[PDB]
Design a protein around this nucleic acid. Structure first.
Ligand SMILES: [Mg+2]
Ligand SMILES: [Mg+2]
Ligand SMILES: [Mg+2]
Ligand SMILES: [Mg+2]
Ligand SMILES: [Zn+2]
Ligand SMILES: [Zn+2]
Lengths: 368, 184, 368, 184
DNA sequence: CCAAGACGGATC
DNA sequence: TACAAAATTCCATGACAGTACGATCCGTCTTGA
DNA sequence: ATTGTCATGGAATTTTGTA
DNA sequence: CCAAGACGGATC
DNA sequence: TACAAAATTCCATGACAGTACGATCCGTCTTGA
DNA sequence: ATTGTCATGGAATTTTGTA
């Protein structure tokens, strides 16, 4: 600190400081003549304090902090001392927005058979229609067949009663849902375990994980909106009509309706398809198996130019769900324990326990 | 001539005045013509109002071409005739005093009559909660002649809950004495 | 309708129907043997009704509606009859989402001199600090200098009292603001007209129009958040500190602070720049004019592959601001009266009057 | 030697006990050393508490290197000395009974003394609302010797409101009689 | 029949 | 074996993500004297 | 311990009818 | 000292 | 006139857009008998 | 009658010190 600057003034060379420049003492402080101007060189011990003083003014990044220090001070490797202080500041790490996008979105394989994967979700608190407010939506992963159930509450008892009428048709293998209170409850967990159904849960605050039910909710709302144009919002009576409509709707990219993918033949619905009229049911079901297997699979989009991929041991920060006014929108730095896929990891959170979080609600810790 | 298909003919019938369970007394039995798939709906009365309410939940999933039923008042009513006319369903009524459905439908209807009473003995007030597991049992019963269950004929695949072992559906010695004591 | 189908059955040729196919009458209806199967050809008068019947099932697009009609019916140019019915349906036009992105965002020229353009906006209802809830933010268009004013209400009287202390320094040419009640008021309109200041207003529900104040609000909130980590949210006393901090903050892309761009020399602020120490003030102001003129101008980004550009006479639909539950999020079709720029147009709205709306809240009317 | 710059020296002074206007009685006058830019702040008392409160709004925009003031109690207080120490401002006090500021500062201070009284005659209770337009008038007054207004020296450009014509700042015949009647 | 008010609308 | 146009496929685009409520002013429709 | 999805409607490409 | 409850937390 | 590394520029990325409140269940901490 | 903007922090490129 004082020994490095003392040898520099008398002509002796130290690595970092160029020999071409003139070094002189003025006002009890070591200064250097530079093309930018006369700059003061501080001792090593004071350098840690000065960077902290210039940073804590407005809590700025690498370049904006240096430009404040460059007004008066100069030393070898200034940015290396700035970046080091940038990773130390707790206030900056949990507030600043990430400049790295998430990795390419995975497109998981469509369920092989019907009743293999069940996607369930409520469509919020709709305007009061005959006492009912909520709608439980069950979407099949394979076919895309939708069952609608009107409920007064997003409770466990309302979910059980509605699914018991549905499970009368067929028992599903795996039921996928978001981490709602009705689905994360122990009563619903013991309900599925009794019938031999595995419960699958979406990553917290990541609604696109269970997209097959979320995208269907868009088609349900869009159809209900069009049917209630210029009319009072009574949707309760329209639910059985909407259910029948969307299940018999042709998908332009799939070429088949959710009804045609589930049964094989169209019912007595308006504009029924009668192409397999000549063939027998045994031949119709054999053709149905060939259709289900030979459906298109959406290819994964190319990775963005600046995308980060999570690895084991990397420091990451979890996003705060609903941050209060003037409160940090990121949690304290946490270590990755295990990587399930390039989109989902298990991390030891701020509380101090195992938590499965998607990478969209995560950012890599800066300055490492 | 076209071969028999699903949703061609829906056989509907009520089964007796069963003991009260959660306010319900009657069961609407819906049997498909080709597949033999069974739909059970709990009702409070053998009326048209209860038949329309239960079938509206069924027709939202799939609509039959022809509905078959006996000369019951709930089906032969003009209100039920207007109900089927709106959805474009032809009504077929069997001759009085002697019904006609076929061997596959009648053998299925015979199983529902005896399976419900088998589970009813000992617990007559708790048949409502058994309705889901009764529907699963009937639709996954290994066909007597054919090698396809009602689930396999309707969807094309085998069910996730296959009923491997079968009880003879018959009432045991002490189950007969308890059933003869509940009435008298 | 009946004449075209009658001549077709007896062998005589009509344009549209291919002569290679066999046409026969069955069940009192004209049918055709096709590779897809036996399809019924309806008369011209019934074709308009059939397309309407198949569409009103689920209110579907071009391909999804046709696939319902293709189950039973066939005629020459089916899609031309479908698209025609798609433009007639009022329910579909005001509910369906647009598949065309907006044109490339314009980057308007930075104000030439200080006090030429003033950007003002409130930062919502912040948590109660010493009675105050709102903060009036004034951003200079040229320099980026920010003046902060604590207020209890987003009212006209609160805006006038705060600006009267500011206009004591210098009178601005044009004041830009969003269409808030305090700024659109006649009292505020007569306030600016008295001092000879032109009022500029942002397009309704388009916050990025006045971005110079909106982006600065992000820097104000981010700095206030970091200063209140682990502390009760008292922001009232921190406002004069935040004001001084952000105005002396170096912009990494501009190389100069809002303070340096406004005055030319740094004040007695911590880490003050003393490069123009040797030069006189007359030489310092001459250098300041050269700096202001030679600042970078962000080039406009390339237009997207599927973008629409508004023209005079084109039918467009205005976006509903805050749509109710199960209610249309688009207004009735409206005609463009005048195009100001490729981003802003004047339209005769649903009410029946002139309205200046940005293209982001607008979509081109489908099927024209 | 370095040439004179803005924010080098800030001359602060109170101007008399003016008639009550919206609760305010005193005016804190802030004059820059080089540019001659004038900041006016309404205060209720000639106290340190009122001086600190008004200067905190000014220092949030720009901080002076040196603050110059007379031997007034509001400036010579230990509380004001600690206030300037925290922000890193050196305090300079003029000799008692005879102040020293310079020709440019004293000629500017002379204009503020007479411009306020010119607009005060006829309406002594309404000087608070004139404060913004008085500040604009002083900062855009065409310099007597130099060819640059206080606005042009501070920002570098000409103001949007340039005061083209000048009244002689002198009181007219009947304005003198009204001013001599308000006191007696 | 008119002055202070009540109320939905527009926008943030 | 080559046209022109219909028919079909391609694919960027946006919306689904628990939502309703307050605060300001303005233009319009009340309710007692 | 888990993961985006798909209707839409102009444009881009392929098929079709008749040489 | 314990049974019904009160309450913030987590997630939608 | 060539290195290696520091110094500087480049630039994709996200957040600013009036926000707080309710409804469900669960784990934990009460309050009278 | 009007219009996106800019801090951030890794990567991409240029400058620098000393041959
Ligand atoms: Mg949910
Ligand atoms: Mg009967
Ligand atoms: Mg605002
Ligand atoms: Mg004095
Ligand atoms: Zn920081
Ligand atoms: Zn429609």
């Amino acid at each position: 600190l004082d020994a490095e600057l003392d040898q520099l003034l008398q002509g002796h060379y130290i690595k970092g400081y160029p020999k071409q420049y003139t070094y002189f003492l003025e006002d009890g402080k070591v200064k250097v003549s530079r093309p930018e101007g006369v700059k003061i060189i501080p001792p090593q011990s004071d350098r840690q304090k000065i960077v902290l003083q210039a940073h804590n003014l407005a809590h700025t990044g690498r370049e904006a902090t240096l430009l404040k220090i460059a007004n008066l001070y100069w030393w070898p490797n200034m940015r290396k001392d700035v970046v080091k202080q940038l990773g130390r500041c707790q206030q900056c790490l949990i507030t600043n927005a990430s400049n790295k996008a998430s990795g390419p979105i995975l497109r998981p394989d469509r369920p092989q058979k019907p009743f293999d994967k069940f996607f369930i979700d409520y469509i919020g608190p709709l305007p009061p229609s005959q006492g009912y407010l909520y709608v439980l939506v069950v979407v099949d992963g394979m076919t895309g067949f939708t069952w609608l159930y009107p409920t007064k509450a997003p409770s466990t008892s309302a979910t059980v009663k509605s699914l018991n009428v549905l499970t009368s048709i067929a028992i599903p293998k795996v039921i996928h849902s978001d981490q709602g209170a009705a689905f994360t409850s122990s009563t619903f967990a013991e309900w599925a375990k009794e019938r031999g159904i595995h419960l699958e849960f979406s990553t917290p605050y990541h609604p696109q994980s269970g997209s097959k039910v979320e995208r269907k909710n868009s088609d349900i709302k869009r159809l209900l909106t069009k049917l209630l144009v210029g009319r009072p919002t009574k949707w309760y009576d329209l639910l059985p009509v909407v259910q029948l409509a969307l299940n018999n709707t042709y998908s332009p990219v799939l070429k088949y309706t959710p009804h045609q993918l589930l049964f094989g033949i169209d019912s007595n619905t308006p504009f029924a398809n009668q192409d397999t009229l000549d063939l027998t049911r045994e031949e119709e079901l054999s053709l149905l198996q060939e259709i289900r297997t030979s459906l298109y699979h959406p290819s994964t989009p190319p990775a963005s130019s600046r995308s980060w991929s999570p690895v084991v041991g990397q420091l990451v920060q979890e996003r705060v769900a609903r941050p209060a006014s003037l409160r940090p929108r990121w949690h304290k730095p946490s270590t990755v324990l295990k990587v399930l896929n390039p989109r989902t990891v298990v991390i030891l959170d701020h509380l101090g326990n195992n938590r499965t979080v998607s990478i969209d609600n995560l950012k890599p810790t800066s300055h490492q | 001539d076209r071969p028999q298909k699903p949703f061609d003919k829906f056989f509907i019938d009520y089964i007796g005045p069963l003991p009260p369970s959660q306010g319900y007394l009657y069961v609407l039995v819906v049997v498909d013509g080709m597949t033999g798939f069974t739909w059970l709906y709990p009702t409070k009365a053998p009326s048209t109002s209860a038949t329309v309410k239960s079938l509206n939940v069924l027709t939202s999933i799939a609509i039959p071409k022809v509905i078959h039923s006996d000369q019951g008042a709930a089906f032969t009513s003009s209100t039920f005739a207007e109900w089927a006319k709106e959805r474009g369903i032809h009504l077929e009524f069997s001759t009085p005093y002697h019904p006609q459905s076929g061997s596959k439908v009648e053998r299925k209807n015979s199983d529902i009559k005896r399976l419900l009473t088998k589970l009813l003995v000992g617990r007559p007030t708790k048949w409502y909660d058994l309705l889901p597991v009764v529907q699963l049992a009937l639709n996954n019963t290994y066909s007597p002649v054919l090698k396809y269950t009602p689930h396999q004929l309707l969807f094309g695949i085998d069910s996730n809950t296959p009923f491997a072992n079968q009880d003879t559906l018959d009432l045991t010695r002490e189950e007969e004495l308890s059933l003869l004591q509940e009435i008298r």
